[PDB]
Amino acid sequence: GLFQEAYPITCASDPALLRSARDGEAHARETHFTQYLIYDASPLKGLSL
Amino acid sequence: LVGAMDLTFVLPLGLFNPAMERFAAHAGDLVPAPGHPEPRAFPPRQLFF
Amino acid sequence: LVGAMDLTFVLPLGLFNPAMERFAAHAGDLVPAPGHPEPRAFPPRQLFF
Numbered sequence: 001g002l003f004q005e006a007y008p009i010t011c012a013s014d015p016a017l018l019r020s021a022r023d024g025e026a027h028a029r030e031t032h033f034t035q036y037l038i039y040d041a042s043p044l045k046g047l048s049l
Numbered sequence: 050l051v052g053a054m055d056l057t058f059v060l061p062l063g064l065f066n067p068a069m070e071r072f073a074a075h076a077g078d079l080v081p082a083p084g085h086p087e088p089r090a091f092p093p094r095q096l097f098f
Numbered sequence: 099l100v101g102a103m104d105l106t107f108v109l110p111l112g113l114f115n116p117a118m119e120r121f122a123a124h125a126g127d128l129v130p131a132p133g134h135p136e137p138r139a140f141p142p143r144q145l146f147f
Contacts, residue, residue, distance in 0.1 A: 006057040013093035015119050016079055031070040032079060033089050043056070077125025082139040088118060095118065 007044070012037040063094045111145050 012018050013035045020029045025039045073079070081087045122128070128138055 006059045009058055009098060011060055011096060011098040013095060015097055016121050018097050031066065032073060033071055034066045034091060035089050035093055036066055078123065079121050080125040081121055085120060
């Protein structure tokens with residue numbers, strides 16, 4: 001309510017994209033033919049749960 | 050000394066890849082069985098998280 | 099103090115992967131000899147462990 005902001009999470013359009021974006025974004029398949037992916041950018045990134 | 054951090058989250062759903070990012074990053078990858086349509090070529094409606 | 103424990107287990111047979119997940123990670127892999135039918139696109143009837 002202060003920044004009037006929000007954050008994404010780890011989400012994508014395919015399970016194929018969800019698999020290779022696992023262990024982090026060192027090799028994140030961020031985009032593909034029509035598909036896409038969002039790596040989590042958040043105060044909650046880097047944590048477990 | 051315990052409490053709540055409330056964070057709203059944003060997920061774009063069913064949007065579409067822009068005109069530049071429609072590549073594959075390698076030739077042979079995300080390939081179907083040879084009698085199958087490769088469903089990654091149409092606009093996505095699914096979402097995974 | 100040397101004790102006991104039981105666990106129950108779930109194993110799937112014969113199921114079929116959903117259509118978004120029928121992909122392969124790479125194109126050239128799990129290929130037979132060049133005159134052979136590629137039986138990997140068949141309904142799975144086994145389970146190994």
